[PDB]
Amino acid sequence: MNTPKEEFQDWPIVRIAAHLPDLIVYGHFSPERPFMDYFDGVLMFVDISGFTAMTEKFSSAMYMDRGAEQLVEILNYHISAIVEKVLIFGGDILKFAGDALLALWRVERKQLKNIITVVIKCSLEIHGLFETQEWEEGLDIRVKIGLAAGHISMLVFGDETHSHFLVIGQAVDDVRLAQNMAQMNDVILSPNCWQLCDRSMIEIESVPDQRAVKVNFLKPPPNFNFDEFFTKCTTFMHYYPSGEHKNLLRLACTLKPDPELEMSLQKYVMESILKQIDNKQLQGYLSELRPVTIVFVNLMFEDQDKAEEIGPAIQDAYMHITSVLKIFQGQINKVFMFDKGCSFLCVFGFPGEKVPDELTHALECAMDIFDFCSQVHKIQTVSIGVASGIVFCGIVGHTVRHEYTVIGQKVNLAARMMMYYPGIVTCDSVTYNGSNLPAYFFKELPKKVMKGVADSGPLYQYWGRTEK
Ligand SMILES: Cc1n[nH]cc1-c1ccc(F)cc1
């Protein structure tokens, strides 16, 4: 009797699972919104820092109308190799944001020390991928890595149709601080990561005026064998592909159809992505250089450390944000923590979602979100940056682990505006000029020097309809 091999694994549920971490795929949590959960882990924040001198160059006549296609191809080539490294070393990629990603090794406290060693080896191996690498004949392309460790809270919020999750807490804020101390080729350890790590393994140098450390070397003891040590470490990794599935990058590739699980997983994924997953849209339709308006919403909390307070506040803000965005077919593309503030990357004019007067509407939506969230219990400050122009849209990452993302100078500008101009709604010159709304709706702002942005152009506050 024949025994044909190679099981089917290309189900819709498996395609949806590529867009999600194991944290969600295998999460099995309660129906309530918000849901909060508490654990320990190691975080890795990887930034690709060459990928700016190419995005706006991919929008040039050089690329002959295939700018977005060439951009996503070369980015995915490089990001895919980082993803395979994280997955093989047992990490869970939480989220992609442009040419950057956050990964998690979740583990019980007693295993943090050994898991840190695994995450350090992974990090140096990621740097090794880029040792003699270039984008074009002249531009290097290297990464910066921040590592943090300790207590981590997960927040899941949303409504009956949409879900979003966030990691929160001091380790999360730590990994961002560690990452932006990093220079090209660095691995920076947060102060608590350094306090928790196996110091007999790792040669460090001090970071001036910082308690965070830079890794110089991983110098193993005489009888140390990384492969055997890694094997011992997989004992504590719930979902590490093993045995029969030792050849897979993710246990999620083995997901079987399950209507209840699929209903729950699809809530995290945009409808245009689901349409492609269902073979009802061309697989390449979402890769594009596209004019859009970014509405970047930051919420700062009265107690920035009180996870139990911030959960309901984010839930309340989200409930109103989603209802305002729906009206103009605007989308939440990402949510993440930024200076212990909750940030919503909102996008107007996505594929099949472009509607006229996009600019007037992004501004009125921003103000609507601003007025409501300002009155949300425990929200201390609302800040909104609005910028409009050509941005890259596309699915970024590896075949087994990828997310739809936006990349471009206007994305970074809206993010810098909400941080540098807190407590107000700001917009760039494109939005101001193209709103045609009368000038007295705006206030022209002092020019601030903003990290990463070279000549923002004139910036404005959206003052609104009245003097009050
Ligand atoms: C999210 C995201 N997707 N693409 C770019 C970003 C980003 C995130 C934070 C930030 F400060 C500036 C840009």
Ligand SMILES: [Cl-]
């Ligand atoms: Cl997050």
